[PDB]
């Protein structure tokens, strides 16, 4: 009955509304859940949660990374009408905003529902509107009534959706990216029996805004080998050719070879990539190869840290990423945690040396 | 008969197929060739080759950088038809892919030729196709037959072209960027008689994917003054005005004042820029000023290292960059090595101080 | 090990650069190779090579035709810049010219490589350029330097590609059309043990420029039954429906029922068509039916000769026709020669009479 344990952890984390820069609700909980399984634990400057397991050897340092932040919207202006105007946080696209229900939170504590509306059809062409033409409806008739609700410019809004079950293996919610990867990280932390190498478990901030938290968190820790856990695109929907699927739901986590931007986001360190594959294989964990032409994860800037950090990514397949409607397959999450647990367990101080290279002289 | 020595070195390096992340074939050789001329030599984490010459003084540190990687294609899907689909590595443009012959290499060792084909004309408009409509033809009728060939998703492909001579001064090949600059670096390494200052010779990785190797390599070395050697655009072809040429073949290496992106790639440290010019001048080496509105080299992120690194670029003029068909002028390469040799030789511990600036107090 | 014998013959013929009107290099060799197997042999006015086998009967005359010429480019103007402008020979399309390497030959003997270049991207839209915007780069800085290279207006250029092997059954080169059919013809000439009927073996000129050599060659010979051997379109690539493939590689030569131009190129004489099929069938040679809506071969104007000539076509399937990158399947060539050998062997003076028709009176 592991399935139920995953779902409940995910409901806990995805009902928390924490878009980039605002992650404190999730930030709190993650610390709580992380606490017993770690030797040392802290929250850094930017609010990264850092757990630490010293394992048994003099060994080395391996880091595991997942981001807490989700996309969302900043309320930017408040109309005299009482309506709210927004600007996006991260990779938000307007198709996902139309006739959607939203939760706004209150510079202090509270939560009001709102509705993203449109001009009506009579003002022939559709034509997804533009953000500046969108507005949020919280049920107020004035700016005064809004202020009186406690909501101020700068308050964030987030998709109003809670986990629902799609058949036996799959689920829907907002904010699977990356809460799903926090979950996977956290739940590999439980399965963990000790290991040669020191493990840093890091739940990061501000990734959707372009990998900011993962950049800084890694600088102070600087480990030998880092591992990112993020979602990755799955196009195995209809009207798409099998060549453009990139991953399939329920076919296992995706070990990343390349992602984004004419490559250039990350081409993962082949030796970490090679490692992950042979482990999965020998442990008969199902897996996929992530070779993708768009998007990037924490590992883009981690592998760029200092002299360099051998880095790779375990990515979990997700449909309709960056919508309220994202879909994930629970088996992909289970095997995700397994492949993570193994990676840490099977890591050795000797293997961590290839990796830093000779000295021919 | 220097001309012949350059060509053969270039054939050696450009017949090596090493797109970004995959540079190991070149990586090997460069080490070999670099070995005798260096005091200390090693390959770092990411596979950067680093040679070290200690010269005679307590002096300082100057670094020289060239990238080994070339653009190419990842095979992404394998059709049941037996055809291969690709996604690009670096700055690949579709015009260069049409009816081109390609070499695919084999996750283990081997090399199969392939053909990049198109839908036929009958499916009026041309209309350069899109990458997703392209496919590679290796002569197989099935996915099975492909796997049996040893080629897997993730295997890279590269232009099939070997050096050819265009008249007396010029040559064609794939991957001039940057193998031509490795060559120049390597061949200035030979001409080198000692010097006051410590010299780090670095053949870098993953530049086409946006300067990744040069970022990390420089962090651990951190030198006072760095020098990039890259190709730069030459438009001196027909149907282009003399104002948009930017450089001419056979007119000498291009000392970089500015490149890219509304500037913003690099505006080279004027004092290193000034230095390079006065040296070239006094040594009557022909040269050009590289002032360009697109593209960037290693020196963009090198000059950004730590407190900053005085940095400049010797760029060699190249026609049709990022094609199988690139053209280079051998004189530009010869004078390139000369201007590099001089720069290192003429560098002094005293000059290396201006450069870090006063202290008024 | 027949496979190797075909390849080497093809390398010999396709490394010969002989576009329409210029076929002399191929013209020479074909004569050489044809010589031992023929009774009488000669080269006519236009340079057609004509071999003659008298077989054993008073019998009749059957002719076999293949064209030596390939598409190419005439250098038309020579810029002061030193660049060359071209106009096409035959059915050349601009998509095949972009970033292609070319061989120019020298009104007297010699061969210089050249590069077909383009305006750079900055002069949004691609937009395959137009021939008048293309130029060839031979590495020269002046018209003077070009003339000094011996290259004059009127000199032809041709794709620079030599045979490469794609897996076990298939190969790439320029000029498969029709050198592949010369090869097939030539190699059926070897397998030939005598026959009732007189055989004329003809390697023709200027077909890509619209069947000129086949028109004149046949007039003086005038035979009863003629056979063309040409390539034909194979679309069995991706993104094309099985209804538009027209032929498949490795499925056998294509006996032609109809080709081109709302038919109108050739509707082959059904009795020769019928003949070819029943022979292939009974001899269990694999074959295809060529029913096509574009393109035409020598047999269009042969069947039009004098009172008429019963005519048909054995066509060999080819992918990416009229590119540097054409692909052919060696089995299609082997069975092509077999079906040719049979046709000649199985031909009889009695069968040659149906064919000329009654006289009811």
UniProtKB/TrEMBL annotation, chains A, B, C:
Keywords: Aminopeptidase, Hydrolase, Metal-binding, Protease. GO terms for molecular function: aminopeptidase activity; metal ion binding. This is Aminopeptidase from family M42. CDD domains: M42_Frv. Coiled coil: none annotated. Belongs to the peptidase M42 family. GO terms for biological process: proteolysis. Pfam families: Peptidase_M42 (PF05343). The active site is at 207 (proton acceptor). Zn(2+) 1 binds at residues 67, 177, 230.
């Amino acid at each position: 009955e592991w399935r139920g344990q995953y779902i409940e952890l995910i409901k806990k984390l995805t009902s928390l509304h924490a878009p980039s820069g605002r992650e404190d609700p999730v930030k709190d909980l993650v610390a709580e859940l992380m606490k017993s399984h770690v030797d040392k634990l802290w929250i850094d400057v930017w609010g990264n949660v850092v757990g630490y397991r010293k394992g048994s050897k003099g060994s080395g340092k391996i880091m595991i990374a997942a981001h807490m932040d989700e996309i969302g919207l900043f309320i930017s202006h408040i109309e005299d009408d009482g309506f709210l105007r927004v600007i996006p946080i991260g990779g938000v696209l307007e198709r996902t905003l139309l006739y959607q229900r939203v939760v706004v939170r209150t510079r202090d504590g509270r939560l009001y529902r709102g509705v993203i509306g449109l001009k009506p059809p009579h003002v022939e062409a559709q034509k997804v509107p533009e953000l500046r033409e969108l507005f949020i409806d919280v049920g107020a008739s004035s700016k005064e009534e809004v202020e009186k609700m406690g909501i101020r410019v700068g308050d964030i809004a987030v998709f109003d959706r809670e986990v629902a079950e799609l058949g036996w293996n799959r689920i829907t919610s907002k904010a699977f990216d990356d809460r799903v990867g926090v979950v996977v990280m956290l739940k590999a932390l439980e399965m963990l029996e000790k290991h040669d190498v020191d493990v840093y478990l890091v739940a990061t901030v501000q990734e959707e805004v372009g990998l900011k938290g993962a950049k800084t968190s890694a600088y102070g820790i600087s480990p030998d080998v880092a591992l990112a856990i993020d979602v990755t695109i799955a196009s195995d929907v209809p009207g798409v050719a099998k060549s453009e699927w990139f991953t399939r739901l329920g076919y296992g986590p995706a070990i990343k070879i390349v992602d984004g931007r004419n490559a250039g986001g990350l081409i993962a360190h082949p030796k970490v990539g090679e490692f992950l594959v042979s482990i999965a294989e020998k442990k008969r964990i199902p897996y996929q190869l992530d070779v993708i032409s768009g998007g990037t994860t924490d590992a883009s800037t981690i592998a760029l840290n200092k002299e360099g950090v051998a880095a790779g990514t375990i990515s979990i397949p997700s449909r309709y990423i960056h919508s309220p409607v994202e879909v994930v397959d629970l088996r992909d999450l289970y095997n995700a945690s397994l492949l993570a647990k193994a990676f840490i367990e099977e890591a050795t101080p000797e293997w961590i040396q290839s990796i830093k290279g000779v000295v021919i002289k």
